[PDB]
Design a protein around this ligand. Structure first.
Ligand SMILES: Cn1c(=O)c2c(ncn2CC2OCCO2)n(C)c1=O
Ligand SMILES: Cn1c(=O)c2c(ncn2CC2OCCO2)n(C)c1=O
Length: 114
């Protein structure tokens, strides 16, 4: 059920999303800007292992289309994106190091939900 706080909380989520996409974090956020192109990268098992792909461009489209009804739904998608990275890649892979840094940006600001 929708709560009167949902629009304001979604604005906070949109602000986080803008930050994740901003130049400030680009050095480690860039792998997450677009869907994993498994075939281009030679990752021919990616879609057998990752059943629910997610990335920041998809989160952005869902936010712009008013798909997310509340902050929790938004956060589940952002976390899904990171979890897919941790599931597919060895934990010492550089993309995992980048995911951990971007997730730290996300979690600390999500925790500041007004
Ligand atoms: C392959 N590769 C990128 O694609 C990239 C990048 N730094 C940023 N990006 C992403 C680019 O910025 C705007 C959206 O695409 N670097 C260092 C890189 O190696
Ligand atoms: C999330 N994600 C990527 O974005 C990715 C990738 N393999 C390549 N890329 C694109 C870029 O190349 C070097 C760092 O990320 N994998 C396995 C992955 O999980």
């Amino acid at each position: 059920g929708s709560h009167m706080q949902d629009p304001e909380q979604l604005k906070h989520c949109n602000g986080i999303l803008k930050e994740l996409l901003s130049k400030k974090h680009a050095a480690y956020a860039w792998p997450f800007y677009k869907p994993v192109d498994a075939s281009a990268l030679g990752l021919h098992d990616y879609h057998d292992i990752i059943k629910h792909p997610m990335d920041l461009s998809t989160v952005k489209r869902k936010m712009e289309n008013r798909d997310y009804r509340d902050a929790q739904e938004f956060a589940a998608d952002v976390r899904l994106m990171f979890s897919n990275c941790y599931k597919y890649n060895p934990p010492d892979h550089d993309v995992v190091a980048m995911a951990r840094k971007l997730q730290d940006v996300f979690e600390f600001r999500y925790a500041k939900m007004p």
